[PDB]
Amino acid sequence: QPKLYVMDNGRMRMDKNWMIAMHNPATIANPNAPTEFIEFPIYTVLIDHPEGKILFDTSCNPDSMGAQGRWGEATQSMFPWTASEECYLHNRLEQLKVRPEDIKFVIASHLHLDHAGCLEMFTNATIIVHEDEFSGALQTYARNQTEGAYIWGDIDAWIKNNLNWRTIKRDEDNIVLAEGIKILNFGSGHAWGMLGLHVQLPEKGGIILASDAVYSAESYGPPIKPPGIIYDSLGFVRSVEKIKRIAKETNSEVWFGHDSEQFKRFRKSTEGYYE
Amino acid sequence: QPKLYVMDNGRMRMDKNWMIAMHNPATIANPNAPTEFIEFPIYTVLIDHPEGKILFDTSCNPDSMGAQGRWGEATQSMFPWTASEECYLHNRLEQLKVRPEDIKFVIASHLHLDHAGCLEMFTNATIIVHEDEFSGALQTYARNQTEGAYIWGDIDAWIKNNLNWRTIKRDEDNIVLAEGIKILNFGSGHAWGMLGLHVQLPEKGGIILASDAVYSAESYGPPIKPPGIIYDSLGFVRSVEKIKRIAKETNSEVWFGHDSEQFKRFRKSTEGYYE
Ligand SMILES: [Co+2]
Ligand SMILES: [Co+2]
Ligand SMILES: [Co+2]
C-alpha cells in the first residue's frame, strides 16, 4: 500500500503580477499603483509505491542562488529562492531513508527552474517529460541563455549526466505508470508542455497534482485568473477547465503548485504521509 | 489617385502593464515597484479612394465618459479617454467635408471600445469585421456586461441602427476592397479576430494599418513584447511576425495602433494628407 509524502523545499518570492496578471491595475486615483512581492512554497511529492518510488517535480538546484549560482543575476533578484539546508531535495529524501538511486520514475511537470532543478540527481530513474517542453528547453540551451526560467546550468547537467528520458507525445494522455498513478497531459499553456499526476490513494482517495498549470486557488477561481506572462493563454484556460472536469468526475482534490494557504494545511514529510 | 487622412481622436491613459506586460517587475531591491499611467493617442484613418471612401476604425463614442457615459465606472477609471469636441470623429469628418453617408466601407479592426465607438453613425456603409470578433462581442452583449473593453451601450446602438455587416470568415485573407486596398486577416491574438489594412499609395508606397495587433514600437521590437492581459498569446506572436513578413515583402511602413512618438510625426487631417 502506497505512502505519499509532501516535501517542503523552501520559499520563493516574486512580483504578484507574475502570479495573477493585472491583479491591481493603475487607476486615475492611483496612477502609480505599487505591486507587491508575495512569498510562496516550492514543494515536491514522493509516492512510495509497491511497484516503485515515484517523484513528482524536483524543486530548485542547491547551486541556484548567489554570486556563483546557476541562476542569472536578474532572475535571482526577481524570483529569489530561500531554502535552509534541510529543505534541499536530497536532504528531504535522505531524512526518509530514500536515496536518489531508489527512484524509479520522475515526473517533470515542466522544465522550469523551480521544478526541474535536481533532475540531474536521478541517474537511475526514467525521467518523464512532455516532448515539446523537452524540445523548448533544449533550444534555450543551444542559444546559450543566461537569464530566464530555463536554467542553462541545470540543462547542461542533465545532458552531462545522461538521464533516461521518456517523452510524452503531444497526443498522449492518461498514461498509467503504476496502479493508482496516472500522468495527465495538459499540453501547452503555462509552458510548452505541462504534465500533471492523478494519484488514487486507498484511504484519502483521488489527488491531482497540478503544478504550475494552476498556481493557486485565486488562479483556479472562478473566475479563472491567468498568470502575468503566459506562453499559451488559450491553452492555459483550457488546461484549468480540464483539471476542474477531471476533479469533478473522479472526486479528486486538486493540489496547486504554489498556494501558501493550501500548502500550510498539508501534512509534510517531517510529520508523516498520506495513504 | 487616392488621398489618405489621419484623424486625431484624442488621448487615453492606462497602466503601462496593459501595453507592455511585466515592463518593470518587482525585485528584492524594489519589492513594491510602482507602475505608471501612460498616455497614448486614439486615431482613425480615412482613405479618399475614387472607387469609394474607406474608414479604418472609428475611435470612441462621444457619450463614453462621465456619470451618464456608456463605459462602466471601473473602465473609465482604468482607461480614461480625453478629447475636446473637435477630436470627435463626426467633427473630424465634417472638418474634411465628408459625410458619414458617403463612406462605402468601414473596417472594424476589432470591436473594442476605442476602435468601434462610432460604428453607429455609418448606416449606409458596409461594416467589415472578423466573424469571430462579431460573435464574441455579441456574446458579451447577451450577457449584459457593464464593465470591460466591449461596450454594452455601443453594441446596443449598432443593433438598433441596423448596420450592414459583412463578416470576414476566419479562413479568408487578403480581401481586395478597391485598387491598392487590401484587408489583412490576422485572426485571434489581441482579440477574437483582428483585421488590418494594406494600403498602396502611388507616391508614399505601402502602408500597413496594424491597429491593436501591434500597440507600439516597443511591442514590435524585436524582441516582441506582448500586452499584459492577452486573449490569445500564441496568436498574438504569430500575427506580429506575419505583419513583419508582409511589411518586408511589400516594403511597407507599419502604422501601430497607439504609438505616441509615431503618431506625433504623422500628418494629421488638420494639416493635409498622404497621396
Ligand atoms: Co513554471
Ligand atoms: Co512553479
Ligand atoms: Co486600441
Residue numbers in the entry:
A (entry chain C), B (entry chain I): 9 to 283
From the paper:
AaL was also crystallized bound to a glycerol molecule. Glycerol may originate from the cryoprotectant solution that contains glycerol. The molecule interact through two of its alcohol groups with the metal cations and with D122. In fact, an alcohol group is bridged with the α-metal, D122 and D220 at 2.0, 2.6 and 2.7 Å respectively and the second alcohol interacts with the β-metal (1.9 Å). Surprisingly, whereas the metal coordination is very similar to other lactonases from the MLL family (AiiA, AiiB, AidC) and the PLL family (SsoPox, SisLac, VmoLac), and the good resolution of the structure (2.15 Å), the putative metal cation-bridging water molecule is not visible in the electronic density maps. It is however difficult to conclude whether this molecule is present or not, since the observation of this water molecule can be difficult because of the strong density peaks corresponding to both metal cations, and the conserved coordination suggests that the conserved bridging water is present in AaL. When compared to the AaL structure bound to phosphate, both structures align very well, with the exception of the 237-loop. Additionally, the metal coordination is slightly different in the two structures. Indeed, the distance between the two metal cations is bigger in the glycerol bound structure, as compared to the phosphate bound one (4.0 Å and 3.5 Å, respectively). This lead to a shift in the position of the residues H120, H123, H266 and D220 which coordinates the metals.
